[PDB]
């Protein structure tokens, strides 16, 4: 389970590529305003 496999064009903005194995796998930390786990929902804040 997870998506470490490729961290290419894996984040959209805040995208601080941090392995969240902890809870799941590899993810990005998006800005306070961009979330959804990929800063794909740039909730412009």
UniProtKB/Swiss-Prot annotation:
Residues 1-40 form the EGF-like domain. Disulfide bonds join 3-17, 11-28, 30-39. This is Epidermal growth factor. It comes from Mus musculus. The chain holds residues 980 to 1024 of 1217 of the full protein.
């Amino acid at each position: 389970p997870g998506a470490p496999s490729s961290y290419d064009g894996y984040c959209l903005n805040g995208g601080v590529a941090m392995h969240i194995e902890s809870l799941d796998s590899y993810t990005c930390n998006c800005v306070i305003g961009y979330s959804g786990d990929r800063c794909q929902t740039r909730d412009l804040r």
